[PDB]
Design an enzyme around this catalytic site. Sequence first.
Site, mmCIF file in Angstrom:
data_model
loop_
_atom_site.group_PDB
_atom_site.id
_atom_site.type_symbol
_atom_site.label_atom_id
_atom_site.label_comp_id
_atom_site.label_asym_id
_atom_site.label_seq_id
_atom_site.Cartn_x
_atom_site.Cartn_y
_atom_site.Cartn_z
ATOM 1 N N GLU A 126 -41.852 88.060 -74.794
ATOM 2 C CA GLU A 126 -40.503 87.531 -75.054
ATOM 3 C C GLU A 126 -39.378 88.535 -74.863
ATOM 4 O O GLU A 126 -39.516 89.694 -75.236
ATOM 5 C CB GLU A 126 -40.389 87.020 -76.492
ATOM 6 C CG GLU A 126 -41.334 85.917 -76.883
ATOM 7 C CD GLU A 126 -41.360 85.717 -78.379
ATOM 8 O OE1 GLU A 126 -40.291 85.622 -79.000
ATOM 9 O OE2 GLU A 126 -42.455 85.656 -78.952
ATOM 10 N N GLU B 217 -41.408 94.066 -80.871
ATOM 11 C CA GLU B 217 -42.499 93.461 -81.627
ATOM 12 C C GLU B 217 -43.820 93.695 -80.929
ATOM 13 O O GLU B 217 -43.918 93.582 -79.720
ATOM 14 C CB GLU B 217 -42.205 91.965 -81.738
ATOM 15 C CG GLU B 217 -43.204 91.129 -82.496
ATOM 16 C CD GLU B 217 -42.796 89.656 -82.563
ATOM 17 O OE1 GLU B 217 -41.583 89.345 -82.548
ATOM 18 O OE2 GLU B 217 -43.701 88.805 -82.631
ATOM 19 N N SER C 294 -56.294 77.458 -84.946
ATOM 20 C CA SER C 294 -57.343 76.479 -85.206
ATOM 21 C C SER C 294 -58.621 77.208 -85.598
ATOM 22 O O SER C 294 -59.591 76.603 -86.038
ATOM 23 C CB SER C 294 -57.576 75.636 -83.952
ATOM 24 O OG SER C 294 -56.760 76.079 -82.866
ATOM 25 N N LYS D 28 -36.004 84.326 -85.776
ATOM 26 C CA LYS D 28 -36.408 84.173 -84.401
ATOM 27 C C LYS D 28 -36.913 82.718 -84.303
ATOM 28 O O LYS D 28 -38.084 82.434 -84.613
ATOM 29 C CB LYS D 28 -37.547 85.157 -84.201
ATOM 30 C CG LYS D 28 -38.245 85.151 -82.924
ATOM 31 C CD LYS D 28 -39.644 85.600 -83.212
ATOM 32 C CE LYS D 28 -40.257 86.130 -81.969
ATOM 33 N NZ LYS D 28 -41.685 86.318 -82.186
ATOM 34 N N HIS E 249 -40.484 81.054 -86.100
ATOM 35 C CA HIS E 249 -40.902 79.695 -85.828
ATOM 36 C C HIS E 249 -42.265 79.870 -85.189
ATOM 37 O O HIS E 249 -42.800 80.968 -85.190
ATOM 38 C CB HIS E 249 -39.937 79.074 -84.824
ATOM 39 C CG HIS E 249 -39.859 79.813 -83.521
ATOM 40 N ND1 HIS E 249 -40.409 81.062 -83.332
ATOM 41 C CD2 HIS E 249 -39.302 79.465 -82.338
ATOM 42 C CE1 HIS E 249 -40.196 81.452 -82.085
ATOM 43 N NE2 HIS E 249 -39.524 80.503 -81.466
ATOM 44 N N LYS F 193 -44.413 84.373 -90.605
ATOM 45 C CA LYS F 193 -44.796 83.050 -90.123
ATOM 46 C C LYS F 193 -45.515 82.368 -91.271
ATOM 47 O O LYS F 193 -46.702 82.606 -91.464
ATOM 48 C CB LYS F 193 -45.741 83.142 -88.936
ATOM 49 C CG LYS F 193 -45.064 83.484 -87.634
ATOM 50 C CD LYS F 193 -46.097 83.900 -86.599
ATOM 51 C CE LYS F 193 -45.430 84.152 -85.271
ATOM 52 N NZ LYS F 193 -46.443 84.499 -84.270
ATOM 53 N N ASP G 264 -46.480 91.581 -85.571
ATOM 54 C CA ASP G 264 -46.795 90.160 -85.531
ATOM 55 C C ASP G 264 -48.304 89.994 -85.619
ATOM 56 O O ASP G 264 -48.810 89.631 -86.671
ATOM 57 C CB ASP G 264 -46.249 89.517 -84.264
ATOM 58 C CG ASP G 264 -46.466 88.013 -84.239
ATOM 59 O OD1 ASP G 264 -46.492 87.389 -85.311
ATOM 60 O OD2 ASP G 264 -46.617 87.442 -83.152
ATOM 61 N N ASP H 49 -40.789 91.370 -77.610
ATOM 62 C CA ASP H 49 -42.046 91.043 -78.233
ATOM 63 C C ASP H 49 -42.955 91.248 -77.063
ATOM 64 O O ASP H 49 -43.024 90.417 -76.164
ATOM 65 C CB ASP H 49 -42.088 89.576 -78.649
ATOM 66 C CG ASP H 49 -43.414 89.176 -79.300
ATOM 67 O OD1 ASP H 49 -44.473 89.777 -79.000
ATOM 68 O OD2 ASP H 49 -43.390 88.235 -80.116
ATOM 69 N N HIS I 46 -46.217 81.249 -73.483
ATOM 70 C CA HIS I 46 -45.030 80.418 -73.719
ATOM 71 C C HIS I 46 -44.564 79.981 -72.317
ATOM 72 O O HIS I 46 -43.795 79.017 -72.168
ATOM 73 C CB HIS I 46 -43.888 81.163 -74.441
ATOM 74 C CG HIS I 46 -44.265 81.705 -75.784
ATOM 75 N ND1 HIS I 46 -43.328 82.199 -76.668
ATOM 76 C CD2 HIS I 46 -45.464 81.830 -76.395
ATOM 77 C CE1 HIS I 46 -43.942 82.603 -77.770
ATOM 78 N NE2 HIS I 46 -45.237 82.390 -77.630
ATOM 79 N N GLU J 292 -40.531 77.606 -75.727
ATOM 80 C CA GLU J 292 -39.411 77.990 -76.578
ATOM 81 C C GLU J 292 -38.023 77.790 -76.026
ATOM 82 O O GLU J 292 -37.059 78.292 -76.599
ATOM 83 C CB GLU J 292 -39.547 79.433 -77.064
ATOM 84 C CG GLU J 292 -40.884 79.773 -77.726
ATOM 85 C CD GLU J 292 -40.818 80.967 -78.694
ATOM 86 O OE1 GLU J 292 -39.779 81.674 -78.779
ATOM 87 O OE2 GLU J 292 -41.826 81.177 -79.406
HETATM 88 MN MN LIG Z 1 -45.472 87.956 -81.256
#
Ligand SMILES: [Mn+2]
Lengths: 433, 433
Positions: free
Chosen positions: A166, A294, A39, A395, A372, A344, A319, A244, A157, A209
Amino acid sequence: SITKVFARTIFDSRGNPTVEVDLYTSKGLFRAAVPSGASTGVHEALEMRDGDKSKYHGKSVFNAVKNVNDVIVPEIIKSGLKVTQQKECDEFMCKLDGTENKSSLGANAILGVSLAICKAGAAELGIPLYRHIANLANYDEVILPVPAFNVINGGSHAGNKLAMQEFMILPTGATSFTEAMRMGTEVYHHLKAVIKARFGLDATAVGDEGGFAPNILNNKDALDLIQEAIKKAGYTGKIEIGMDVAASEFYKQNNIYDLDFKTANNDGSQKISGDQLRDMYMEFCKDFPIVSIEDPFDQDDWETWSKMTSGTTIQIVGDDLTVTNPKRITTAVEKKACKCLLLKVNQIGSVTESIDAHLLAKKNGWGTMVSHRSGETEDCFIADLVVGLCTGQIKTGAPCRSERLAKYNQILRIEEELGSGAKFAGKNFRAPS
Amino acid sequence: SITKVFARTIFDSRGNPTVEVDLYTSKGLFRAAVPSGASTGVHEALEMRDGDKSKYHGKSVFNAVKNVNDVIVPEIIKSGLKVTQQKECDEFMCKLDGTENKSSLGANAILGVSLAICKAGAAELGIPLYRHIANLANYDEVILPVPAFNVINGGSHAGNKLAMQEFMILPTGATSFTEAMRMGTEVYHHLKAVIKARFGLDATAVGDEGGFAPNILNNKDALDLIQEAIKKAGYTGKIEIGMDVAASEFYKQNNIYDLDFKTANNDGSQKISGDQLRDMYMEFCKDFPIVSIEDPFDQDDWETWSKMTSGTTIQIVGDDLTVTNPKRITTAVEKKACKCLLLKVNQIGSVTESIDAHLLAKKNGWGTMVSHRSGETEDCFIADLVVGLCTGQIKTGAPCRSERLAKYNQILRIEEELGSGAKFAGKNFRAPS
Ligand SMILES: [Mn+2]
Ligand SMILES: [Mn+2]
C-alpha cells in the site's frame, strides 16, 4: 438486559458472506457487522467459514451465524449481563468459547455480538458511541484522526508487479478533518488524471480498497506518481506519505526478500537481503515525505525491525508482526521492534480485547492506527472507535467505494457534532492523546 | 411535524461530494443521502454543484446544502405539513422551487429532504419503509425483486473498447432472493477466475459499479465470458442476461451508430446504421439468453425503438429515452417505444414524482426497473422502494463495493422480515404485480 440476539448472513464489499448481528434491549435494535478475517491463521483469532467449496466458494458463514443464534444468544440472555458491562459480556463469550483463538465459536461470531453490545451500551448510557468507547478506555477527550488514504496498490488488494502492498497519503498538514477530506479526494482525482495520462484510462480501475493499481514496476515509481498528484493539487508540504510494505509476503529464504515482484523468474533482479531492503527504505525516507512504514520486514525478522526502529524517526507500524495480539505486542515492546500498533478489531475478536491491545501499546509509548479490512461492510463502527480511542490515525481506504466512505462520512458527522472545539490530530497524529 | 431539517456534505462511492439530510420529528432522526445526478442536463432534474473547479474539482454542493438549511428547512417547518403528507410536502418544495427541473433549489436539495420525509412518515405510522411506499403506491402486497448484477463494463463506468455500457446477469430462475444472491456472487467469482485466466490478474480490477472491465473488443466477447461463468457455476438456464447499450453515446451522424468503440480511427469498422445495430441485437437474442435490453438506440431514435419493441418479446428499457420524466414516458407510451421504465429517483427529484412516474408506466402496461446511480452512497433507500413499488426488478450494481451491497443486504433483511410467505419475482420479473 439483552432481550434478543439474532445473527444473519450479509455480503462484504468483495461479494463474500459475513456475519451481521441484531441485538435488542428495551432501548431497541443495535446492529453490527463483521469485516474480513483469517478463516484460519496461527496468530489471529479465527473467523469461522464453512469450507464447503460448493456453497459460496467455501466462504459461507452459516456455522458462525448458528453459533451466535443457538449458543451465544440464549447463553448471554440467561447470563443476565447488561450491555453496559462490556468487559463482562466479552469475558463471558470467551469463556463460552474456551479456545484461545476463538476457534470453537468463531471470532466472527463473538465480535459481531461484542460490537452490538457496545452500541447498545452507549445507548443505555445516553451518549454517542465514540464517547462510550473513550470512557471504556478512560479518555476524557476525543480527537479527530488523520486519514491514511490508500491510493496505489500492489502485492495484494490488486496485482501487477509492484510488490509493496500500500501507498497512502496523509493530510497531516490539514487544519481539520473536513479540510483533510478535501485534500484527500482532490489528490485522489488529480492522481486519477495522472494515471489515466501516463498509463491509459483502463489503469484507473480500482482494487479492493478503492485505490488505483497501474502496472508500475518500481515502488519508487508509485511514490513519484503520488508526489506528482500532491503537487498538481497544490498540497505539497501538507500531505505526507505512508506505506505498508507487507514484506512478509516476499520474504523468501533466510534473510532474503524478493517475490520476484510477482515474476516466476524475476529472481536475482531482486536478490536483496534485509539490510539492502532497509537501505532502500532510507533512500525513500530522505527523498519522499514518508512518515510511516508498516511491516518493513517479515513478521519474524525481529532484528531488522529493531534496527530500523532504532535508526529512524518515523513511524514503524506492526501489522502481521503484532496481529493485534497482546502476546505479540508484548514481545515487540520488549524488542523495541516498532512504535505503532495497527488495530484490527476482528483480528483479536472482541471490543474489550481490542481496547486492551491499544492501551498496552499506548502504555509502552506506541502509536495506534485503527484499521479497516480488505473485505469491509457498510458498518461505520471503527470510525467511532478511532475517535473514542484518541489514536489520531485511521487507515480505512481511499475515498472511493462506500464501505470506505461509510467510515469517513461518519467521522465528518462526529466532527460536526464536536463543533468548533473539535481537535484534529494533524502533525501530532503519531501520539496526540 | 418536522422539528428540524439539516443538510451536510458527505462523499459518494466515487469520492465526490453529495447531500445528506437529517430530519427530526418527535419520533427522532431520519437520515437520507442523495446519489449521482446531472449537474446540468436538458431532460432530468438538475443536481446543483458549485462549479468552482478549485474546490473539489467543481463538484462541491455547499449551495444545495445551503438551499436546504436556510430555504427549504425554515419554510417547511413553518408550513406545518406532517411527514405523513408525502405528496403535500413534495408539492410544497416544488412550488418553493418554481422551476420545472428543480434548478432554483437543486434536485439534490429537494430529493434529500423528500427521502427523509418518507422515512419519517413510515416511522410516524409505525410500519417499515417498504410498506409505507406500497401504501403510498396503493399496493396491498410487496414482492422481492430479481437483481440485475452488472458484471462486465464498457462505454462508461469503465473504459476499454467495448462500447456497450453494461452486461448484467439476472437470477430469474432463482427460488428466492437468498438463492439469487448466492447464484449472483458465485457467478461473479467464477467470472473473476475466468477473466484472470483469459486476460491476467490485473483485468480483475473493478469499475464504478463493481464489475470487471477486461480489454475485450466485441460485445459478443462479453456475452461469451458471462456465458462461461454461468456454466462453470452450474446455473445455466436459471440465470438470464440483461444489457444496457447506452447507444446514445455512440450515435454519431444521422442514423449512424459507432463511437469507433473508443478509437479515433476505428471509423468504417463500425459504420452501422440503426437497422444493422438492430439486427445485431436479434442475433444476440437468439444466441444468448438475453431477456432485457436498455437503450438499444439513441434517446431520439424513436422509430428504431418502436420497431424493436414491436418485433421482439423481450424487455426494452428506456433510460436516457424516458429520463424518469412523465412527459418523456408519455411520448414513449404513445409511440410504443419501449415496455420498461428505469426508475432513477434523483432524475425526477422527489419520492412523489418518482412514484407517479412508476404508476404511469405501470398503468400503460410497462415494467419498472428501480436503478441505483454510478455514484451511490451507503443509503439503502431504493431497496425498500423496489420492494414497496412491487416492480420485481432492481439494478443496483455487481455484488461488489458496499454502496451496492448496502441495497442487496437490505433486501435480504426485508426478505427475512417477510418470512416464509415472501414472494420472489423470478420469471415474472417483468410485471409481477
Ligand atoms: Mn498490512
Ligand atoms: Mn442506462
